[PDB]
Scaffold this motif. Structure first.
Motif, PDB file in Angstrom:
ATOM      1  N   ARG D  23      41.716   5.672  87.196  1.00 50.97           N
ATOM      2  CA  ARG D  23      42.166   4.462  87.489  1.00 50.97           C
ATOM      3  C   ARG D  23      43.314   4.885  88.617  1.00 50.97           C
ATOM      4  O   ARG D  23      44.461   5.105  88.129  1.00 50.97           O
ATOM      5  CB  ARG D  23      42.401   3.463  86.429  1.00 50.97           C
ATOM      6  CG  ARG D  23      41.610   3.242  85.692  1.00 50.97           C
ATOM      7  CD  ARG D  23      41.856   2.026  84.686  1.00 50.97           C
ATOM      8  NE  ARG D  23      42.197   0.695  85.688  1.00 50.97           N
ATOM      9  CZ  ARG D  23      43.477   0.198  85.298  1.00 50.97           C
ATOM     10  NH1 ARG D  23      44.112   0.428  84.106  1.00 50.97           N
ATOM     11  NH2 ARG D  23      44.135  -0.776  85.792  1.00 50.97           N
ATOM     12  N   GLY D  25      46.428   4.140  91.017  1.00 48.66           N
ATOM     13  CA  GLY D  25      47.520   3.124  91.163  1.00 48.66           C
ATOM     14  C   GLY D  25      47.838   2.568  89.723  1.00 48.66           C
ATOM     15  O   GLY D  25      48.197   1.164  90.023  1.00 48.66           O
ATOM     16  N   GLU D  26      48.126   3.116  88.839  1.00 44.73           N
ATOM     17  CA  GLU D  26      48.527   2.411  87.609  1.00 44.73           C
ATOM     18  C   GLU D  26      49.710   3.078  86.740  1.00 44.73           C
ATOM     19  O   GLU D  26      50.013   4.300  87.128  1.00 44.73           O
ATOM     20  CB  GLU D  26      47.367   2.212  86.679  1.00 44.73           C
ATOM     21  CG  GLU D  26      46.724   3.724  86.159  1.00 44.73           C
ATOM     22  CD  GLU D  26      45.817   3.370  85.039  1.00 44.73           C
ATOM     23  OE1 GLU D  26      45.741   2.438  84.413  1.00 44.73           O
ATOM     24  OE2 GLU D  26      45.050   4.459  84.730  1.00 44.73           O
ATOM     25  N   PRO D  27      50.448   2.478  86.334  1.00 44.83           N
ATOM     26  CA  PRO D  27      51.748   3.128  85.568  1.00 44.83           C
ATOM     27  C   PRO D  27      51.162   4.145  84.661  1.00 44.83           C
ATOM     28  O   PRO D  27      50.770   3.742  83.521  1.00 44.83           O
ATOM     29  CB  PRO D  27      52.334   1.867  84.979  1.00 44.83           C
ATOM     30  CG  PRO D  27      51.986   0.530  85.701  1.00 44.83           C
ATOM     31  CD  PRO D  27      50.383   0.935  85.853  1.00 44.83           C
ATOM     32  N   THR D  29      51.608   5.902  81.319  1.00 39.94           N
ATOM     33  CA  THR D  29      52.480   5.805  80.140  1.00 39.94           C
ATOM     34  C   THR D  29      51.545   6.526  78.939  1.00 39.94           C
ATOM     35  O   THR D  29      50.327   6.665  79.011  1.00 39.94           O
ATOM     36  CB  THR D  29      52.154   4.148  79.631  1.00 39.94           C
ATOM     37  OG1 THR D  29      52.925   3.423  80.606  1.00 39.94           O
ATOM     38  CG2 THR D  29      53.204   4.042  78.304  1.00 39.94           C
ATOM     39  N   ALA D  32      49.339   4.066  77.000  1.00 41.57           N
ATOM     40  CA  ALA D  32      47.823   3.638  77.761  1.00 41.57           C
ATOM     41  C   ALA D  32      47.069   4.782  77.960  1.00 41.57           C
ATOM     42  O   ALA D  32      45.959   4.633  77.883  1.00 41.57           O
ATOM     43  CB  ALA D  32      48.714   2.901  79.195  1.00 41.57           C
TER      44      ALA D  32
END
Lengths: 50, 50, 100, 50, 123
Positions: D23, D25-27, D29, D32
């Motif tokens: 995915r 462009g996601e933070p 972590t 996650a």
RNA sequence: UCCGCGGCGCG
DNA sequence: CTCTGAATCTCTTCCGACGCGCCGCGGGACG
DNA sequence: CGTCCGATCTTCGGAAGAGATTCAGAG
């Protein structure tokens, strides 16, 4: 094309124009009433996408 | 040796599985508002997606 | 024939999403940033003046607000399809062609 | 040869790499990324071998 | 125990027809996960144009903007995950997807005055 | 009645 | 050392016969 | 009787063309 029933034979063009004009006049209503800056940003983005 | 066949049973199983995952997502969403025995297990269940 | 009055400027997709990047080649800057500027996620400088920014200076959201804090007097950065239209207005064909 | 081209040498950074790749462009972590990796290959809800 | 800033408002994009449902869903998540201190309130704009006749009667519920909602939070990745996990809603709007930008409070209290001006003397 | 999509068949 | 630079590798995109006939489908959730 | 529109299907060549890399060279 008038179909026998409660709905007519509609292509995608009229629906696309309806969506775009709804987006445009809703943006016009937002900007005229001095909408917040963040709202009109994504509004213009989604209008461009449409 | 690596090609199999599946029949109406497998298609029904897969479609029913998809319907069940959708309906159980809905049931979990509605049961998040769960409360003491004022509900009787028919309104949470929706046969329309199935 | 009729017309609809777009309240905000928008970019024509064919001049953008084609294998020859007509907007990109005319602006002489790779199409990656034009997409981001058009879809409202980054800032572009339009004649920032005698500051530490270039004519085609691409900026992010955080750097834009920081620059606005120090250079809000005359440095101007606009963002969006309206910004692209304004930037295209502020260029001349003859000087660019002779320079190239 | 694969390890020579490897951009990471630790579990956290490899999880970050795969999380960002699948995915964009996601933070990034730790929690996650680890949860997504476990739900791709080890959670019966999404991954299932007959 | 030293960070006590102006507690922030962000914007969340909600699908049409679920605005109140999104608001009560966030309220339910707040009351369920029990971080009621980290999260605040939700300010969705409402105004009431009243007409006695002409189709819809005695009331007409319209609002400034349907596509978006304003929600009170702090800056937290856990809060970000909690908001994203809410169903029937898309998520934040900002410069970048990881950290949305706040909203200037000048237009915030301007729209507070606007809703106070439009919304007064019920019925 | 008029539009579109999918499937099948014929050459 | 270094910038260039020709070459190399990688990522995106438009494409895939032509007629005819038959049948089936053509929203859908919500205030 | 009108109004307005969020989860992952997943494996072709075959080139053509554009974008990113690279490492190599006179020095």
């Amino acid at each position: 094309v008038p179909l026998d029933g409660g709905r007519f034979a509609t292509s995608d063009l009229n629906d696309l124009y309806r969506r775009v004009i709804n987006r445009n006049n809703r943006l016009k209503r937002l900007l005229d009433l001095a909408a917040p800056d963040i709202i009109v940003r994504n509004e213009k983005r989604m209008l461009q996408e449409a | 040796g690596n090609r199999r066949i599946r029949s109406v049973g497998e298609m029904a199983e897969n479609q029913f599985r998809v319907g069940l995952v959708r309906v159980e997502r809905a049931v979990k969403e509605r049961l998040s508002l769960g409360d003491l025995d004022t509900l009787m297990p028919q309104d949470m269940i929706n046969a329309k997606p199935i | 024939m009729g017309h609809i009055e777009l309240a905000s400027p928008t970019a024509h997709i064919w001049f953008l999403k084609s294998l020859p990047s007509r907007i990109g080649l005319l602006l002489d800057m790779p199409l990656r940033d034009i997409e981001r500027v058009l879809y409202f996620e980054s800032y572009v400088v339009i004649e920032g003046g005698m500051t530490n920014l270039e004519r085609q200076q691409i900026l992010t959201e955080e750097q834009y607000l920081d620059a606005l804090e120090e250079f809000g007097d005359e440095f101007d950065a606009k963002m969006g399809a309206e910004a692209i239209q304004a930037l295209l207005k502020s260029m001349d064909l003859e000087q660019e062609c002779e320079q190239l | 040869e694969t390890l020579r081209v490897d951009p990471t040498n630790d579990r956290l950074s490899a999880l970050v790499e795969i999380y960002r790749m699948m995915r964009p462009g996601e933070p990034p972590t730790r929690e996650a990324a680890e949860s997504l990796f476990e739900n791709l290959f080890f959670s019966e809800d999404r991954y299932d071998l007959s | 125990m030293s960070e006590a800033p102006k507690k922030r408002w962000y914007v969340v994009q909600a699908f049409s027809g679920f605005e109140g449902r999104v608001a009560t869903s966030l309220r339910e998540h707040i009351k369920l996960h029990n971080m009621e201190d980290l999260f605040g309130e939700v300010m969705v704009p409402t105004e009431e144009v009243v007409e006695i006749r002409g189709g819809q009667r005695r009331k007409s519920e319209r609002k400034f903007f349907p596509g978006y909602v304003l929600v009170q939070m702090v800056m937290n990745d856990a809060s970000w995950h909690l908001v994203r996990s809410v169903p029937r809603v898309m998520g934040f709007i900002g410069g970048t997807s990881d950290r949305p930008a706040p909203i200037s409070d000048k237009e915030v209290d301007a729209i507070m005055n606007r809703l106070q001006q439009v919304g007064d003397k019920p019925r």
